[PDB]
Structures are given as C-alpha cells and as structure tokens.
Design a protein around this nucleic acid. Structure first.
Ligand SMILES: [Mg+2]
Ligand SMILES: [Mg+2]
Ligand SMILES: [Mg+2]
Ligand SMILES: [Mg+2]
Ligand SMILES: [Mg+2]
Ligand SMILES: [Mg+2]
Ligand SMILES: [Mg+2]
Ligand SMILES: [Mg+2]
Ligand SMILES: [Mg+2]
Ligand SMILES: [Mg+2]
Ligand SMILES: [Mg+2]
Ligand SMILES: [Mg+2]
Ligand SMILES: [Mg+2]
Ligand SMILES: [Mg+2]
Ligand SMILES: [Mg+2]
Ligand SMILES: [Mg+2]
Ligand SMILES: [Mg+2]
Ligand SMILES: [Mg+2]
Ligand SMILES: [Mg+2]
Ligand SMILES: [Mg+2]
Ligand SMILES: [Mg+2]
Ligand SMILES: [Mg+2]
Ligand SMILES: [Mg+2]
Ligand SMILES: [Mg+2]
Ligand SMILES: [Mg+2]
Ligand SMILES: [Mg+2]
Ligand SMILES: [Mg+2]
Ligand SMILES: [Mg+2]
Ligand SMILES: [Mg+2]
Ligand SMILES: [Mg+2]
Ligand SMILES: [Mg+2]
Ligand SMILES: [Mg+2]
Ligand SMILES: [Mg+2]
Ligand SMILES: [Mg+2]
Ligand SMILES: [Mg+2]
Ligand SMILES: [Mg+2]
Ligand SMILES: [Mg+2]
Ligand SMILES: [Mg+2]
Ligand SMILES: [Mg+2]
Ligand SMILES: [Zn+2]
Lengths: 134, 24, 104, 86, 135, 59, 50, 122
RNA sequence: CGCGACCUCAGAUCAGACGUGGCGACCCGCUGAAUUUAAGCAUAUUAGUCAGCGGAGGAGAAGAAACUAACCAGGAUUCCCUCAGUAACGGCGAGUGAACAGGGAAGAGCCCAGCGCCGAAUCCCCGCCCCGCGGCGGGGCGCGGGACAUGUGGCGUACGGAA
RNA sequence: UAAGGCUAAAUACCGGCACGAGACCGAUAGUCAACAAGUACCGUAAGGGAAAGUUGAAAAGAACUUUGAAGAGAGAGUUCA
RNA sequence: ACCCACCCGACCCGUCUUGAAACACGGACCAAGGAGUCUAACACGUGCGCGAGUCGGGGGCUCGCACGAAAGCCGCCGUGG
RNA sequence: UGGAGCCGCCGCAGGUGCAGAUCUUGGUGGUAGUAGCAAAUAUUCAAACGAGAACUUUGAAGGCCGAAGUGGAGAAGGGUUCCAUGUGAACAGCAGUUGAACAUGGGUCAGUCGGUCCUGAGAGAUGGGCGAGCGCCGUUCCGAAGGGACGGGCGAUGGCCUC
RNA sequence: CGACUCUUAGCGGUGGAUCACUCGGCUCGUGCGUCGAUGAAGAACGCAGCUAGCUGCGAGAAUUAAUGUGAAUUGCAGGACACAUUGAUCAUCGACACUUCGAACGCACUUGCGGCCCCGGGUUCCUCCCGGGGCUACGCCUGUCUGAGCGUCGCU
C-alpha cells in the first residue's frame, strides 16, 4: 500500500497527471529498460530514451532482434520512431510506425557528459541502497 | 439561425370574439 | 446532492389556456432551453424527488456489552474448524487450529 | 397598430456600450449603466441574483495581478533575491 | 426619532408596521455622530466621543480621532493597538463606547442576549440544530 | 504604408524622413476597418517614388 | 451608418477579423476536436444590438 | 548568430543602442520580406529578431534599474518603483522595531517576574 | 498707523503619509417585510427571517464583573453536552422559549484619566559621522525648528497606592 | 464598582490556493457547463441561457483503374475486423 | 412457439362516480427520466444486551490515520437523560 | 452481432420496477406527395458560356414605374453587406452558369464636408443641508467662489549682459 | 401469379436507446488563509511564419532574464545550436516589463480641449509650430510658507 497522504493513488487524477503531464515529466515517464550487458556494466535499471539511442523491439507485431536507431522521440503521443520500424502507406511512401518506450530495450547508449553524470548518480544511489540493505 | 420561439398566445377566444359563444 | 441543483433556473409556469400542461417552463429566450420545463423530478434537468442530505443518520452506535459479546463470539468461532472451513479457509495441513506460535 | 407598425419605427438607441463593464447598458439619457452603475463609485451587485454575481466574480477574467499574488504567496513574498548562478 | 423611509402612507401588509412617525432608531445619536465623523474620515480612527451641547433641533458631540500613520502614535506601545488593521471602523462596527451601549451587551441576568458574540451569535447558537454523528 | 493607430501625420512624416532619409510633401491618413492606419506619403518631386520603392524592396 | 466613432469602428473591425473561417492546417493536429467554427456570424442573423 | 545575455551584461550603453537599432532595421526588413513573400527562411527569422530585441531591451532595463537602486541605496526616501511591493497590508504593517517596543512598566514586569522553569513530583 | 504675540479660519502642483474600490463562505453595526400557520383573520407566527446599506479580519465579536447565587457559597470570555422543549411568553390558541448550577475543550492577564511626587525629566521633523540599509532602525554631534503647562513621560488603577 | 480602553486559545467558514477520500452520479444522470460554457443565442435593459464524449492498437483515414461535370458509385487496397 | 382457416365468446385502457364502451375526461407511436424519500418528536408491536438499574453523550488516552476520519479503553463508568 | 468486463449465494444499503399525469427530453408515422408556391397588366425570338438555359449575359420586339416614380442622393439603423476572381457542398420555400451564399484578395485619403466650440429644454458636480447608509436635495441657494492684466518700483539669469 | 392491405422472419435505411468506458461533477475532511493609488476586481483592444475560437501574454506583447532539468517543438516549412556547450524544450520564477478604460486621478468621456517646467527638431531663448519626458482627483494627518479677522492684549 501507500502510506503518504500526499501521494495521489486516484484513478481519474492519476490519468489526468499522466495525460496532462508537461514535457520534463513526460521525459521521465518515457523511460526504457537497458540490456543485460548495460545493466551489468553500469548497474542502471532504466533510462529515459534520447534522439539517437539503439533499440531492439521487444513486443508487438514488429518484434525482432534488429538493433534500430531511434529516428526521433515524440513525447506528445508518448511514442518513439525507430529507423527500420516503418510501414508502407497506400501511396508507396514509408511512415515510421511508433512504438511505446515500455516495449523498448536499449542496447547502446549515446553518451554525453549529462548522461554520464546521470548514470553515475544512479549508480551511486544504487550503491547507497545496497549498503543500506546490506 | 436562432431557435424559433414558441407560437405566441393568440387572445382569440373570449368575451371579445363573437365567432363562437356558449350559452350565457 | 447540492441544494442549488435544479433551482438555479427561474422558471415561472405557463398557466391555463395553452397546449402545455402546467409545468414550470423557462421564461423567454431564443434558446433550445426556452419554455422547456424544470422544477420537477419528471423533467429533463431540474432536481429530483428527495434530495439526499448530509444530515442523514449515517452512523450507528451499538451497546458496549453487545460489541464485547459479538467480539467474544467471534473469538470463540475463531476456534472450531467446522466453522472455519465453512467460512472457506483451506485448513488441510494446519497442525492445530488454535495456532499459537512463539514470541519470536 | 401596436405590433408590426410599432416595431417599424424603432430607430434611435437608448443603451450603448459601457466603459467599465463593456456591456450594452450605458443609458444615453440617465447617463447610468444599470449593470454596474458607472457614475456611482461602487459596483452594482445584488444578492437576489447569484447568477449575475457568478457571471462576474473574481474567478472570471484574466486575474493578471491576483494570480501572481497567489504565486508570490506560495513562494513566500521574498523581494530582491536572486538564485545562486552557475 | 426616526421616520420610516416609505411613501405617503404605504406600509403594505399587516397593521403592526403601519406606524411610521413614533418609531425610534435603535442606535444612539452619539454613535450616529461617531459614524458620520468616521464616514467623513475613514483614514482616521475613532477612539470615543462626548457631549458639548444641545439645542431643540440639534445635538453637539466631540469625537476623538487618531492617526494610524503618525509616528507619535505608531511608536507608542500603549496606543499601537489602534494601528492594527483589526480596529478599522469601530464607529461602523459598533466598537466604541457610544455604539457599544446600543448593542445591549453586558454581564448578568438582565441581558441574556449577546451571551455568545452578539445578538446574531446568540440567535445562531439558539436556532442551529446540532445533529450529531451518532445522535 | 501601414501605421499604428496612435500616430500623427507629423509623426509619420518625421518617421519616414528619419528612416529612409527622404523628404515628404505631405502625409495623408485613413483608418481601415481592420484597426490599422493607412498612410499615403506624398513625396517631394525632386526624389522619385519608384526608385525609393526599389530601395525599400517593394515592386 | 457612415458617422461612426472610434470605439464603434474598432469594435466592428474586431468583429470583421473574428468572422473568418478555420484554416485547413488545424485539422491535422493531434488533440483536435474542432470541426467547424460554430461562431460564423452573418450580417442578417445576428445584428449586434449595440 | 545568437544574441545571448551573458555577452550583453558587460557592454556599453551606446553599443547596446546601436545593436538595438540594427535589430530594428533587420526587423523592418523582415516585415517587408513577409509582405513581399520572400521565403520561409525569411519568415522564420522574425521571431528570432523579436526575441533578440526583447533580450537587448531586458538587459538595458536591468542595468539601468540596478544603477538607479545603487544610486538611491542609502537615502531615506527612494522612488516608488524601488520601494518593495509585497502586498497592501504587509506594506502597511509595523516597522519590526515598533512591534518589539515595550513600555517601561511591561519591561519592569518581565524583568522582576520572569517565567520560571519548573517541574513537580519529586 | 503700524509693529509684535496668542486665538479662530483659509490658500497651496508646499515636504512627507493615509483612505476611496473589489471579494464577501464565516463575522460585526443597522434596516427589514410578505408568502405560510392559526384549517378564516387582525395580536401572534413565519421573523430580527429574505431582500437592502456600510465595515474589516484570518477569523470577527465577546472578555477580565456596576456577575451568578442565597449555598459549608462559586468566580473573565468563548464553544460542546446537560439543565430543557423546562421556568416563562402566547386571541394562554396556533405556537414561541432562555438562564443558573454541573461535566468537559481552552485558560492570561492587564493598561488609562482622576488622586498625587519628580526642574517637560516627554514626543515629532530636518543638517553631519558610524552599522546593514529589499517590512528606514540604534548611538552621538546642532542657543537647529516644532508640539506640549488648555499637561508629555516615570511610579501608580481598586487585587489598594504613594512618601 | 457602571457611565474609559487592550488582549491570544478553545470557535465559525457553500469565497480563494494547495490537497486527500467516497456503500455518490455516470452524458436526458452528476454543477448551467466532462466538449472552443456563463459559449453560441434571445430581450432596449435588468436578465434568461442551451445542445454537443466515444474511428482504430497504430491513420495504417481507402494509392491506383473505370462511369458521371461533380456529389455519388464498381473494382483494388489497409486493418483481426 | 410463426402464419392462416372454422365455432363460440368478446365494446378502449386509467380516473371522478350510485352508475363508463360512452355523445364524460387524458391518450398518434416509440426510447430514456419520472412521483410516499430524509431528520426530529412520539405511540404501539418485534429482535438483542444488561437489569433497579441502563446508556456513555460530550471529552480524554492509544497509531504514525492504506484499510480510519474505523476500532479499543476510561478512580471522567456516571456530570447528565 | 459484439469486443471487455461480469455473475450465483449469505448479509447491508438505496436516487430500485411505468401505460397514462392537456407528464419532461429526443426521434418518427397517418394526414400527405395533400393545403399551398394566385396582391401591384407581360412577356417573346436568335446567339454566347456550359455536361446542363424559362429565369445568366448580349441583340431585337412588345410592356410597366410615369419626374408626390419601380429614378438619382442623404439621416437613424446595418457593418463589409461595396468591388474583382473562382465554386455551385448548404441557403435564395422551382431551378440557376446567377446572388446581398461560400473561398481568396482589394477598397473608405480633408485647414475648407461634418464632429470637435457654444448654448437651449434639461442634466450634473464644490460649498451648504439631509440621511443609519449606498447616497440624496439644490444650481446661487446657510460661500474667503479672481491665480488675470495695464502703469511703476526692487531683485535675477539667458542671448554680441547696450536692449 | 395480379395491384393494394395485415402479420411474421432475413437483410438494408431513419434514429440514437441499452451496455461498457470517463483528463467531469457532487459531498465530506485537512493545511494555508494572500487583493488594491508602488494602481484591485472587471472590461476593451492588440500579440503566432501560416491563427478563427479556447488558453496564454502585453508595443520586450504564444512571452524577456535567472535557476532547476537535460535533446527537443510539431499540423507543415524554416533556421539556429556542435546536446564535450549558461544548452533546444518544459517547470520554478526571486530580476525586468506590463497598451487603454476602470476606486481611475488635469475637465468631461467625443479619445476632444488644456495649463507648469525640461530636452530634441524650428532656432542658436526670440516668440510660433512638432515630438518626447515629469506633474495637475477628492477628503484628511504632522510640519513649512503666505495670509484674514470693528476675536484678546503691550509701544505710540
Ligand atoms: Mg441536475
Ligand atoms: Mg401580525
Ligand atoms: Mg474589544
Ligand atoms: Mg443605555
Ligand atoms: Mg433584419
Ligand atoms: Mg471598503
Ligand atoms: Mg392561514
Ligand atoms: Mg387553509
Ligand atoms: Mg441578507
Ligand atoms: Mg478582537
Ligand atoms: Mg468593563
Ligand atoms: Mg457564566
Ligand atoms: Mg422569537
Ligand atoms: Mg499625569
Ligand atoms: Mg503609565
Ligand atoms: Mg449526452
Ligand atoms: Mg449514453
Ligand atoms: Mg449535462
Ligand atoms: Mg446522446
Ligand atoms: Mg456513439
Ligand atoms: Mg468486429
Ligand atoms: Mg370529487
Ligand atoms: Mg365508489
Ligand atoms: Mg354523475
Ligand atoms: Mg371505463
Ligand atoms: Mg351517450
Ligand atoms: Mg374533469
Ligand atoms: Mg385528446
Ligand atoms: Mg423507464
Ligand atoms: Mg398513533
Ligand atoms: Mg420495544
Ligand atoms: Mg428530561
Ligand atoms: Mg444511489
Ligand atoms: Mg414511456
Ligand atoms: Mg396540388
Ligand atoms: Mg405572393
Ligand atoms: Mg444608387
Ligand atoms: Mg455585388
Ligand atoms: Mg431553391
Ligand atoms: Zn457598465
């Protein structure tokens, strides 16, 4: 259960805070888990996805083992566009079919200084939590 | 166009109209 | 239900002499809601029969001796595994039904 | 002749747009409003029209000063302070 | 006294209220003088008032007024309760000595109204129904 | 020219003379039924209108 | 009436600029629930009783 | 291409006015290009030019108001724009010393009879 | 044939400040009916009620007895229960209708004028030095002004006070 | 011990800000207003005052051929549908 | 149980009324909404606990309230009805 | 058919069962392809545009309003209805190639034309008076209601300190 | 067989009832309890590249600056930034800014007419004209200046 009386835990209110969330909260909602090699290397469970991360599609009709780069992260519909995850229209043009990032695993990150300090902060928090649980 | 209002009340039958009267 | 629900309209009834039947209807206007009908449980919109109030007798107080009697009967039927299986608890490997364990 | 021929000769106006409430209520002869009472210093409101009150309470317009009063209240009414720069 | 502000006769209803001449205004004329002084100067604050003379057609009162913003009052700890915003328009709310006597408030067996806050509060406690949770 | 509604003819004259360094014979204003002011700036005959229109960009 | 004042002409200019249909690029938005304008004023129906 | 704020914090006022006038010239040229059509590459720069004008005027207004409050900082009567505005009654409150002014009788009471610290049942 | 003081009353785009208005659920001061009931109705009732007017605050008001009681006496005010639908009011008809005491929540006490004793010992504004000056405060330097004996400040208020 | 004054706490809150909960209602119900709602609209004015939720998992919203001027169809296509 | 055929019966429902099929009234048809509720005072009957006693009102003590604004308890277990 | 929640039993609770109320809302029939598209004399032929002509346009003929007009321009009022281009989804109670419809654009230029200035009938402030109060009465009435100027005198800066 | 009429079923139309969903109400409870002449509430008018309405904003006008966060916005174009750089977008917002009416403040409310100083064009203050900047509401409080009085007094 929840014991904090400030946490919402309401049906319509949580749906409101989900579907009317601003962009910096949508970035945290649209986070995806990492592969087992990346989890062993960084001790990081999940990360928000970026413009040019490498992605395997886990569930859906477009399920496969192909590592596809993200085309772009569209945070209004809570979706991402990947390179080879596309589909031909009636007029022959290909449109990228969006996949929700919960059905998305990261195989390679695009590392900059902000992502390095985020992963170091999360690894430090995991180390403090493991020391408190030990 | 706006919604038409209800047909007015025509003060048609009464003391004034001799077109049809009951026994009085 | 709020006290203002159904009576925020100002609907004076059209009386006798017209084809309408004695319902409080909305005064004038070039609106869809114009001479429509309110102030009744039978009308679209309006208020219902018996608006529910906050001062209903919601709560019940029981005698203290009756509450103690019922909780002693509940503690007594916490034993007697024919009453526990008829409640629906799977019991088939429980070694003793007044199951008293250590202080650890 | 109290009907259509009386509607025919309606030319000149009595009420115009007021300049405190912006509604068509400013009477050209009495120089008053009757919706807010413009030559009076006080706003015309009554308790027999709660609907006309809630047409213009304080939660109606832009609230362009009162919303930042509410925000400065929840912030703490501090003045002249700047956050720590980089 | 006070004549009822109606037209020519015209107190419509039951014959209890048709008299308009011989009725009396329930608040004192000294408090009316304090009220008019505070209405003319809402910037000043009424302390109290007293009597300096009377005619057949007029009374004459002297109303003590205090600056909320002058430093001799504002820095004096004895009289800086006046500068607090709770005491705005005592002449209007009936908090001075002339308007307090018209409220009918006091201790004992002779008033029995204003036995809470005022007549309104006494009426409210005596005519609100206390419907409990368990009754 | 299309001008803000709070302007004078002297203001439009000195504005054109300050911006494009050209002398003005007269300024002739109207207000469109869209809120904006329309200014016909009659120029002095020593300077051409088509040349200064080519300078300001319109053709 | 050809003898307008500045306030009346400014009000009528804003009414002219409001009487304008919805552009076609609105309907391709994501959270659109707007089909037509529903405030298209004609000079015979609503007569602006100013 | 970007006109930021850190590079404008330390510039001279006449150079800020010259850059403002250059941005106004570019804004007028982009309005003329908008009316003559031009291209979308000219239609998209008008927002950048307007925000750059807003940044330049903002930095100028910052510097002049901190210079004015540095000038009037120290005087007893400062202008109403420089006086603090919290709310009406909060400006009409006391002086933070007048609330702490006690009379000699009350100071004598608090001095001769202070609230003592005590406990019972021992 | 004027000057100088006081007293009353003016004029200032004088130096420095205050109020106007809004919201108004709760609160205070007024004003204030009629539906309805009495199987009619007129006192009564609805009802100090709706409507109307002004005033603030985060609560307001009240409040430390010109009190309750008649007892082995209690002891500011406010609020809950009980007193109690009682005493009492009422074409004694319909109906209206408290309080004391008691059990709790909270609990906090005080200041003036007068009586008097201290050399006005008191207070406001402007010039300069020192402190931070973004709810303009403290100390000193000014035969620098003003208020004030038609009374400012200290002791002192009914529980007594002063020498 | 009246004809002078101050004072928090226990108290009230259908206005406002931030919240939580429901043996409540589920688009003729629940606020007038789940939606561009005090909006469109009506009255000279004070005032009155609506109707109106649902494609699909994703527009992938029917390319192209053919009759008709087109609205409209017949094929073909998308979708588990 | 769908339709048709035959024999006998068979006037259109609700209401006011002594009396309705009525030349008495409401009524084209269909879908949705729609009318004996809630508080207090009583009276009687019934179910339960205790019994010349009964009840805890109000308040206070325990849990920081998921379940809870529940529950448990009171030299207040009787101030009081 | 449908595509995402639902039911039985023991108990509790209610906004719990419709055929009517000239019931409220919404929708649809017979009437019924019926009444009607009949006030102010009147249209006809050929051609252009088009898929389409009784209504558009052009030419010709015959008519009507008959200068107190079915003409040319204003005021109140309307607010883009004015003009061009394109369409014929909806409207113009038949149709339309047409429109005051729809969609893009465009259009109103003043020292001399009016407002602006004055005052009339009147309205409405200050003082004053009244009123519990929002405010009300009144425009010379219980008013210190002028902020201007000529000639002269003193003092001062600005411009070749002469003027 | 006909046409037409009645009933039933299959299918197709008008219509939106039932059911299932709900970024919405209603009720109860908690914490705070804050507007305004330093210009409130409200109203009017403008502001987007393509923008009608809602929402947001104020000629710096779909937002400015700072801080936090860290690669977008999006319906389509466009251009910035190298996201190894105070750095796109969002939130906080404490700095800046906030047209006109409005208690509304020079007088009235047509956006008409003014008065007093200063600056820039005109000019080299010498008066016109134009633009910009600061004042000019009422009542009242302390003090200053100018005063009035056959109101009360001292010298002549
Ligand atoms: Mg309802
Ligand atoms: Mg009576
Ligand atoms: Mg008091
Ligand atoms: Mg008395
Ligand atoms: Mg018309
Ligand atoms: Mg006020
Ligand atoms: Mg009666
Ligand atoms: Mg009766
Ligand atoms: Mg009232
Ligand atoms: Mg108080
Ligand atoms: Mg007392
Ligand atoms: Mg007592
Ligand atoms: Mg009574
Ligand atoms: Mg003394
Ligand atoms: Mg003292
Ligand atoms: Mg619906
Ligand atoms: Mg439905
Ligand atoms: Mg609804
Ligand atoms: Mg529906
Ligand atoms: Mg549907
Ligand atoms: Mg299907
Ligand atoms: Mg009968
Ligand atoms: Mg019978
Ligand atoms: Mg009979
Ligand atoms: Mg019958
Ligand atoms: Mg018969
Ligand atoms: Mg009958
Ligand atoms: Mg019938
Ligand atoms: Mg039903
Ligand atoms: Mg009985
Ligand atoms: Mg019984
Ligand atoms: Mg009893
Ligand atoms: Mg229910
Ligand atoms: Mg039915
Ligand atoms: Mg026919
Ligand atoms: Mg005809
Ligand atoms: Mg003509
Ligand atoms: Mg035309
Ligand atoms: Mg037609
Ligand atoms: Zn108005």
């Amino acid at each position: 259960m929840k014991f904090n009386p400030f946490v919402t835990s309401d049906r319509s209110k949580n749906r409101k805070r989900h579907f009317n969330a601003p962009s910096h909260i949508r970035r945290k909602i649209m986070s995806s888990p990492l592969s087992k090699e990346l989890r062993q290397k960084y001790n990081v469970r999940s990360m928000p996805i970026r413009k040019d991360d490498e992605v395997q599609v886990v569930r859906g009709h477009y399920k496969g083992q192909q590592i596809g780069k993200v085309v772009q992260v569209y945070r209004k519909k809570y979706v991402i566009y990947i390179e080879r995850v596309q589909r031909e229209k009636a007029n022959g043009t290909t449109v990228h079919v969006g996949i929700h990032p919960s059905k998305v695993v990261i195989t390679r990150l695009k590392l900059d200084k902000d992502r390095k300090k985020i992963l170091e902060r999360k690894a430090k928090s995991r180390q403090v939590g493991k020391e408190k649980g030990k | 166009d706006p919604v038409p209002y209800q047909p007015p009340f025509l003060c048609q039958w009464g003391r004034h109209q001799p077109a049809w009267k009951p026994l009085m | 239900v709020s006290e203002l629900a159904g009576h925020q309209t100002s609907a004076e009834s059209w009386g006798t002499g017209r084809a309408v039947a004695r319902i409080p209807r909305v005064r004038g206007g070039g609106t869809h809601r114009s001479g429509q009908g309110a102030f009744g449980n039978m009308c679209r919109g309006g208020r219902m029969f018996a608006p529910t109030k906050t001062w209903r007798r919601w709560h019940r107080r029981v005698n203290t001796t009756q509450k103690r009697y019922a909780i002693c009967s509940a503690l007594a039927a916490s034993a007697l595994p024919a009453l526990v299986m008829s409640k629906g608890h799977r019991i088939e490997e429980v070694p003793e039904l007044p199951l008293v364990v250590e202080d650890k | 002749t109290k009907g259509t021929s009386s509607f025919g000769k309606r030319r000149n106006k009595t009420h115009t747009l007021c300049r405190r409430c912006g509604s068509k209520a400013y009477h050209l002869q009495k120089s008053t409003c009757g919706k807010c009472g413009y030559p009076a210093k006080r706003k015309r409101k009554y308790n027999w029209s709660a609907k006309a009150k809630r047409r213009n309470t304080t939660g109606t317009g832009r609230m362009r000063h009162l919303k930042i009063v509410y925000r400065r209240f929840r912030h703490g009414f501090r003045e002249g302070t700047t956050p720590k720069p980089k | 006294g006070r004549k009822r502000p109606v037209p020519k006769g015209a107190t419509y209803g039951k014959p209890v209220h048709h008299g308009v001449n011989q009725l009396k205004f329930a608040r004192s004329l000294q408090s009316v003088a304090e009220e008019r002084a505070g209405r003319h100067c809402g910037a000043l604050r009424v302390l109290n008032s007293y009597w300096v003379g009377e005619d057949s057609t007029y009374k004459f009162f002297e109303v003590i007024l205090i600056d909320p913003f002058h430093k001799a009052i504002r820095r004096n700890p004895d009289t800086q309760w006046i500068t607090k915003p709770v005491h705005k328009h005592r002449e209007m709310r009936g908090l001075t000595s002339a308007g307090r006597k018209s409220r009918g408030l006091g201790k004992g067996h002779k008033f029995h109204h204003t036995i809470g806050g005022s007549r309104r509060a006494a009426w409210r406690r005596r005519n609100t129904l206390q419907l409990h949770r368990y009754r | 020219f299309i001008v803000d509604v709070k302007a004078n003819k002297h203001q439009i004259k000195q504005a054109v003379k300050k911006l494009y360094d050209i002398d003005v014979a007269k300024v002739n204003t109207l207000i469109r039924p869209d809120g904006e002011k329309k200014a016909y700036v009659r120029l002095a005959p020593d300077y051409d209108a088509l040349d200064v229109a080519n300078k300001i960009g319109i053709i | 009436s050809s003898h307008k004042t500045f306030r009346i002409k400014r009000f009528l200019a804003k009414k002219q600029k409001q009487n304008r249909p919805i552009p076609q690029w609105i309907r391709m938005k994501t959270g659109n629930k707007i089909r037509y304008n529903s405030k298209r004023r004609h000079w015979r129906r609503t007569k602006l009783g100013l | 291409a970007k006109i930021k704020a850190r590079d404008l914090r330390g510039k001279k006022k006449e150079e800020l006015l010259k850059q403002l006038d250059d941005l106004k010239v570019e804004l007028s040229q982009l309005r003329v290009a908008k009316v003559t059509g031009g291209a979308a590459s000219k239609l998209s720069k008008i927002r950048v030019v307007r925000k750059s004008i807003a940044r330049v005027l903002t930095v100028i207004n910052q510097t002049q108001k901190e210079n004015l409050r540095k000038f009037y900082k120290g005087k007893k009567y400062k202008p109403l724009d420089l006086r603090p505005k919290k709310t009406r009654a909060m400006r009409r409150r006391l002086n933070k010393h007048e609330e702490s002014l006690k009379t000699k009788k009350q100071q004598r009471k608090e001095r001769l009879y202070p609230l003592r610290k005590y406990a019972v049942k021992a």
